[PDB]
Design a protein around this ligand. Structure first.
Ligand SMILES: Nc1ncnc2c1ncn2[C@@H]1O[C@H](COP(=O)(O)O)[C@@H](O)[C@H]1O
Ligand SMILES: Nc1ncnc2c1ncn2[C@@H]1O[C@H](COP(=O)(O)O)[C@@H](O)[C@H]1O
Ligand SMILES: Nc1ncnc2c1ncn2[C@@H]1O[C@H](COP(=O)(O)O)[C@@H](O)[C@H]1O
Ligand SMILES: Nc1ncnc2c1ncn2[C@@H]1O[C@H](COP(=O)(O)O)[C@@H](O)[C@H]1O
Ligand SMILES: O=P(O)(O)OC[C@@H]1O[C@H](COP(=O)(O)O)[C@@H](O)[C@@H]1O
Ligand SMILES: O=P(O)(O)OC[C@@H]1O[C@H](COP(=O)(O)O)[C@@H](O)[C@@H]1O
Ligand SMILES: O=P(O)(O)OC[C@@H]1O[C@H](COP(=O)(O)O)[C@@H](O)[C@@H]1O
Ligand SMILES: O=P(O)(O)OC[C@@H]1O[C@H](COP(=O)(O)O)[C@@H](O)[C@@H]1O
Ligand SMILES: [Tl+]
Ligand SMILES: [Tl+]
Ligand SMILES: [Tl+]
Ligand SMILES: [Tl+]
Ligand SMILES: [Tl+]
Ligand SMILES: [Tl+]
Ligand SMILES: [Tl+]
Ligand SMILES: [Tl+]
Lengths: 317, 317, 317, 317
């Protein structure tokens, strides 16, 4: 029967026998996402155009404000903030949340899909909360997911027991569970990478890509897709299968995507869905960070596709 | 002071001393686009999931009905219909409309941007309306444009005087003019093509793509982007500059995109914005259609980029 | 087949061979009403309460701006402004518009139904526009109507040919025609008046009210209803029949309601629907205004009920 | 800072140290109300009007369906159902909810304010759940309140510690706490009753009403208001003060309003706000019902106004 995100979260909080603090965090997040969706869809824009009487900064304020008001967090790391934000002792909670309020911000002007990425850690070292508390490997994530503002708005949530997708019915401001226990196809038929950096790809990426266009056994070549918005390329991967890649290159010898609020959440989601997320040399989730804005290379998607690339990495080493 | 689509179309109908038949038609399109936008964003989905107890199809039905009720059309060609729709003599006007109600339908499940494409012709000749009236070259278009259901919904309308972009304020259901007399960049920095077909690209396309990744003059390479929905790929091109391509290959020696309701509308917008739209051999708008579902290869975008490719084509002539 | 306000106004402008100045004006009103509706229903209130960090006034500003930008008006009389607004010679059209942007403003805090009232005159005379152009008797109205923001938003438009009701589909921001050529019941069963002023009603009003509660012919008594917002009380009267009254008393020997932007528009709708609108002494539409904020007593509704009262008035003459 | 209904309810559930079952009930109710609001505002009505591709019954289905899915109820009493609905042992919970899904249904066609009224009891006699479980005096209510669909949508919730009002921001489908610990003025200046039944009022009502129009000490007479929709007249009373009355008459020797799903909830709300709710002879909340559809006379509002009427009842006895 009808399952709303509000009901699902509360139920899981009950089975889990939690104190209701994490439930509060999850409900504040949901609220922040409906707010950003509305802003993203340009509601009320007639007022900027003088009918009479920023989107990334606004998103940052909504997230930070709604999260602090939940009384469940103590440390916040935003892609928009150079420093980790320590919550007032007044509003503190036991959770640390790393997030990208509006990923794909360069795409705003072209009206391409954008999203919000989040990762939630539980503060374990009980000392005054600080930046150090956010420096945990993703293998330590309690919950992670993202909201994609594409043709429709969807919220993907991942936790210990699985990945579930919720579609937003904008008519009643409610997220509906449209898919339970999501698992990615073992093998896909689409590869996703910015081939404009061909000149700077390592030999392993080079070989794999060419293997997709000219398959050794004359099978059907893979189709190519690259929206240029991580949340959008990763969501397509999750739903239809395949492989997404943002390896290291010249401008980004350590990749472009950040570990804490972009790489780790998508890797956590991928792994819970039955897929793989690697650096090419090691699992993304086992990297212990040193800088909150640390970057990391990432390859994620169907297990068989990711394994095939790993085998080529091993061969050129 | 603010300009809405309704106000704009009306002032334009007035300066042109029209009978008001085309204004009625442009207002019918506006309404259809808002109705589709709403459906695309999933309003009401809670009911489909039993709160109280096909999208390409709904779109088709919406456009066809809203258009017939305009009393301004005589023939309608749809991507979804094998044969052209001849209007009941009662609601028969003088306009022929070609459209793709929801382009990128394959993308629906992944929530990737999708849109509506349309082209309007004035029925030439004085005899019982038939498919033959839609078979006019693109150069004979009265109006053409598209609606993109992406992060926000936008309608781009191109007519003899230029191209204008209207953003939908979903809060009041009104398209606000946000950019007027749009012109495209002379030279962009992004190329768009499905490189999964590399194995079957003609030698000219191969060389160009090669030149974008490894510039012979040691200039910075072009970035790559390919959403997978024409309306999104073309909209990005018009706004940020660059080039979009869908040449022939084993994927039909004639390309995949249809001439009447995909290629022509987009080529018209391009030319009006200052770009070019070619098949590599001739201008898209000058082709005399032979069938309403005729496909055609297409290359469009910034003039300097399109010309650079045309030069390579001539080389391999 | 479905009729929208935009389509209707346009077909009507065409049958009447208008220049399209009044169509532009009616489309400007439509937009203003949708913008106000949205504000009334509190969309965006979360921001006023710090989610990310006057209504009568906003309404006034919306109508005045949207109307000026129509280039179809020369003089605007508002309930909120002491003096009439003369349009900048640039945006000067030939229409004079009288309106109450948000009637029942005192009701705002209790969330009782409220609405917008308007009357449109054609500037008679050929000299610099002034308040004097608004001082025309109601019988000289070109169009009049109201928008009611109640359980749903409805626009009622009355013109020489009749009265039509349009319901707002807030999902697509479009007014759909739901009732055409509306006529009122000959005799209703509800009387509407603020009986808190009993102490000061003239003897005729006293006797009538007495006759509705204790029918001398032993017929069933009339039911009583008095919302407190004229637009809601009048809309109920037009749809269900009955009588609405606001006679003189110590609450101004001339009544409370204004002639130009409250009484006249409503009297016009009434007469066009088949009812009557009198002061008890003369038809409201035949009064020659002396001042733009002139008040006048009013009695409107089903013809048999209004006539029954007029007879009682004559008795006490 | 920003307080949503979701957050407020959860917080109160935590302080209360509840098992989260009642929180689930309250969250299901909230969802049902946003759904009914959307339906009431006529969203999607363009589809009934053939753009191509009941309100009281629909409301009943939404409430019943959303409540059963909460797994927190065992008995339901609807104004629309002749019999109390026993929930399947599968979906049972410990709560009994009495409700009027859409009060003021006769007013739908006139677009007057309407609302949903609810009352929540906790099943105490642990025997197979049945109708008898609903037959509890209102003094036993755990929570009660109503949703008013007027100019804006508001949800009033009352519990042991106070009455709080939440306004719906339709843009993000979220209820915001706009007023905390609401208390009604000790004395008001508006009386609300259907004077059309004058002929059948008892001597006590008769005297009091006339005392409001012709005050003994020449003070200012009370103003009169009567929307004809209980939720709307009761809300105005709560916010602005005064007295609402629906005494017994001929057609209704025991009043018209029902005890369990109309009278008790509003009486519970009134008492928590510091006002009074009486039958004229005794408190509404202390009546032990015998029939689930039992009717009862009711007088509620400011304490000083209600006391003054009670003194007149005592005098004529
Ligand atoms: N909504 C929930 N869903 C799943 N697990 C939860 C939820 N709430 C709390 N938990 C779990 O119980 C632990 C402590 O919860 P809490 O006491 O609310 O901080 C969490 O870190 C998870 O292990
Ligand atoms: N709204 C309008 N905007 C721009 N051109 C228009 C408009 N209406 C009519 N036209 C033009 O005038 C011709 C005939 O108009 P019509 O009588 O409405 O069919 C059109 O085909 C265009 O050339
Ligand atoms: N949309 C319309 N609907 C009904 N009557 C109209 C419309 N437009 C113009 N008229 C009429 O024609 C006259 C002059 O129109 P106009 O040239 O637009 O000012 C008006 O005052 C009405 O008599
Ligand atoms: N959201 C809440 N707000 C206030 N009281 C609550 C809430 N939830 C539970 N309670 C209370 O605790 C009792 C049992 O709650 P429960 O165990 O959830 O059934 C209720 O009947 C109220 O006394
Ligand atoms: O938020 P940003 O600054 O626009 O960056 C977003 C990221 O940028 C990547 C693509 O960048 P390239 O242009 O280098 O491919 C995506 O996969 C990620 O969304
Ligand atoms: O409606 P469809 O079947 O999804 O077709 C859409 C078109 O399909 C093209 C992409 O096709 P490829 O996968 O072959 O690149 C896009 O450019 C156009 O939107
Ligand atoms: O905008 P306002 O100041 O609230 O005035 C509205 C009018 O006020 C009348 C009611 O006044 P009384 O309280 O005197 O009956 C209604 O009939 C009209 O809407
Ligand atoms: O739901 P219903 O059948 O329309 O009844 C509603 C009630 O009816 C009362 C008024 O009825 P009267 O016409 O008898 O005054 C209001 O106070 C209540 O909303
Ligand atoms: Tl960002
Ligand atoms: Tl980044
Ligand atoms: Tl299509
Ligand atoms: Tl196609
Ligand atoms: Tl006003
Ligand atoms: Tl007034
Ligand atoms: Tl009812
Ligand atoms: Tl009732």
């Amino acid at each position: 029967n009808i399952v709303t995100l509000t009901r699902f979260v509360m139920e899981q909080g009950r089975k889990a026998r939690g104190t209701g603090e994490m439930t509060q965090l999850l409900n504040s997040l949901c609220t922040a996402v409906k707010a950003i969706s509305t802003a993203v869809r340009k509601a009320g824009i007639a007022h900027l155009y003088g009918i009479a009487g920023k989107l990334d900064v606004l998103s940052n304020d909504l997230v930070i404000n709604v999260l602090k008001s939940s009384f469940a967090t103590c440390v916040l790391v935003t892609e928009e903030d150079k420093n980790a934000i320590i919550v007032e002792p007044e509003k503190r909670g036991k959770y640390v949340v790393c997030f990208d309020p509006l990923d794909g911000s360069s795409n705003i002007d072209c009206l391409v899909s954008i999203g919000t990425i989040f990762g939630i850690y539980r503060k374990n070292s009980t000392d005054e909360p600080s930046e150090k508390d956010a420096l945990q490997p993703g293998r330590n994530l309690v919950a992670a997911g993202y909201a994609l503002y594409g043709s429709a708005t969807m919220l993907v949530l991942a936790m210990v027991n699985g990945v579930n997708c919720f579609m937003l019915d904008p008519a009643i401001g409610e997220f509906i569970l449209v898919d339970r226990n999501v698992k990615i196809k073992k093998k896909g038929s689409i590869y996703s990478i910015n081939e404009g950096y061909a000149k700077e790809f390592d030999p392993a990426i080079t070989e794999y890509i060419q293997r997709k266009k000219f398959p050794p056994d004359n099978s059907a070549p893979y189709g190519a897709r690259y929206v240029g918005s991580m949340v959008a390329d990763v969501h397509r991967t999750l739903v239809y299968g395949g492989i997404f890649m943002y390896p290291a290159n010249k401008k980004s010898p350590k990749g472009k995507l950040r570990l804490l609020y972009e790489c780790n959440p998508m890797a956590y989601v991928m792994e819970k869905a039955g897929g793989l997320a690697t650096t090419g040399k090691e699992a993304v989730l086992d990297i212990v960070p040193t800088d909150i804005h640390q970057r990391a290379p990432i390859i994620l998607g169907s297990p068989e596709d990711v394994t095939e690339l790993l085998e080529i990495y091993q061969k050129h080493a």
